């Protein structure tokens, strides 16, 4: 019944707010109290360290990786609040988070992008898209496909309460490799999909087939993840100098 789907939508929105400090509404408010420092080239980067809290590219990369680690923690905390998730087989829990985390990272990253750049450091900074594109060797191409996805994804005009259900749906795929019991993951996702359908039709009544258009975006996500994993393998052989966080590259298998 509809009353149960709304209750689940409201639960997930509430946990999303608690697990993710920098929401989309806050990011949209900043992008449009206190403006960010805009990093757009070699010198402002170093003024921004003065203002806001080793080659320049790999420096940016090392911080892009530490942010992802931070994001893994928040997604983990958010996953536990999804009704039925902690009751799954512990190995499936790990498997769902292993394969689910990058798709959510890049989904949430779009909340922080416009066509020009991306908010960094809890919104205190803003790094321009073309400065990022101007990095050397293989780094200039780490962020460009995310920008391309964000532009199309952000055109859907989702708000946080929408994204809470969508992130939850991503986590409970069951499509994932290595899963021991797919059926209880699917009953959960099934109910999440029911919740997302009512949510989008109630929130975006004039937005035709938004539900379906949203699920088709789950294809662009798998692709940028694929693209990114390969970009890391290049980094590893180019940069034997440069390490990687064990939370990330153990997920990165
Ligand atoms: C991969 C990822 O995921 C997310 C995210 C966001 C919200 C929710 C979930 C995930 N955001 C990013 C990218 C962040 C951005 O790329 C970035 C971050 C730190 C530095 C560190 C600096 S700042 C300076 O002046 N010098 C530096 O080296 C640079 C760039």
UniProtKB/Swiss-Prot annotation:
GO CC entries: chromatin; cytosol; intracellular membrane-bounded organelle; nucleoplasm; nucleus; receptor complex; RNA polymerase II transcription regulator complex
Tissue: Highest expression in adipose tissue. Lower in skeletal muscle, spleen, heart and liver. Also detectable in placenta, lung and ovary.
Domain called NR LBD: residue spans: 4-253
UniProt subcellular location: Nucleus; Cytoplasm
Coiled coil: none
Positions with a binding annotation for rosiglitazone: 65-68, 102, 228, 252
Chief subcellular location: nucleus
Crosslink position(s): Glycyl lysine isopeptide (Lys-Gly) (interchain with G-Cter in ubiquitin): 18
Quaternary data: Interacts with FOXO1 (acetylated form). Heterodimer with other nuclear receptors, such as RXRA. The heterodimer with the retinoic acid receptor RXRA is called adipocyte-specific transcription factor ARF6. Interacts with NCOA6 coactivator, leading to a strong increase in transcription of target genes. Interacts with coactivator PPARBP, leading to a mild increase in transcription of target genes. Interacts with NOCA7 in a ligand-inducible manner. Interacts with NCOA1 and NCOA2 LXXLL motifs. Interacts with ASXL1, ASXL2, DNTTIP2, FAM120B, MAP2K1/MEK1, NR0B2, PDPK1, PRDM16, PRMT2 and TGFB1I1.
Disease link: Defects in PPARG can lead to type 2 insulin-resistant diabetes and hyptertension. PPARG mutations may be associated with colon cancer. Obesity: A condition characterized by an increase of body weight beyond the limitation of skeletal and physical requirements, as the result of excessive accumulation of body fat.
Reported function: Nuclear receptor that binds peroxisome proliferators such as hypolipidemic drugs and fatty acids. Once activated by a ligand, the nuclear receptor binds to DNA specific PPAR response elements (PPRE) and modulates the transcription of its target genes, such as acyl-CoA oxidase. It therefore controls the peroxisomal beta-oxidation pathway of fatty acids. Key regulator of adipocyte differentiation and glucose homeostasis. ARF6 acts as a key regulator of the tissue-specific adipocyte P2 (aP2) enhancer. (Microbial infection) Upon treatment with M.tuberculosis or its lipoprotein LpqH, phosphorylation of MAPK p38 and IL-6 production are modulated, probably via this protein.
Domain comment as written in the entry: The 9aaTAD motif is a transactivation domain present in a large number of yeast and animal transcription factors.
Listed name of the protein: Peroxisome proliferator-activated receptor gamma
Residues of the full protein shown: 235 to 502 of 505
């Amino acid at each position: 019944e509809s009353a149960d789907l709304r209750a689940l939508a409201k639960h997930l929105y509430d946990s999303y707010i608690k697990s993710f400090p920098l929401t989309k509404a806050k990011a949209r408010a900043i992008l449009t109290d206190k403006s960010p420092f805009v990093i757009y080239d070699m010198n402002s980067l170093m003024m921004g360290e003065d203002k806001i809290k080793k080659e320049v590219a790999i420096r940016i990369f090392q911080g892009c990786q530490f942010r992802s680690v931070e994001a893994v923690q928040e997604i983990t905390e958010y996953a536990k609040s999804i009704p039925g998730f902690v009751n799954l087989d512990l190995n499936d829990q790990v498997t769902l988070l292993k394969y689910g985390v990058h798709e959510i990272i890049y989904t949430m990253l779009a909340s922080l992008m416009n066509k020009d750049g991306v908010l960094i450091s809890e919104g205190q900074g803003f790094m321009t898209r073309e400065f990022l594109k101007s990095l050397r060797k293989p780094f200039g191409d780490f962020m460009e496909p995310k920008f391309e996805f964000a532009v199309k994804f952000n055109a859907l005009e989702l708000d946080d309460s929408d994204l809470a259900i969508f992130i939850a749906v991503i986590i409970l795929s069951g499509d994932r490799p290595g899963l021991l019991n797919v059926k209880p993951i699917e009953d959960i996702q099934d109910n999440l999909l029911q919740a997302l359908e009512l949510q989008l039709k109630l929130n975006h009544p004039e937005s035709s087939q938004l539900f379906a258009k949203l699920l088709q975006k789950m294809t662009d996500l798998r692709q940028i993840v694929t693209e990114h994993v390969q970009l890391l393998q290049v980094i590893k052989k180019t940069e034997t100098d440069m390490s990687l966080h064990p939370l990330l590259q153990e997920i990165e298998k």
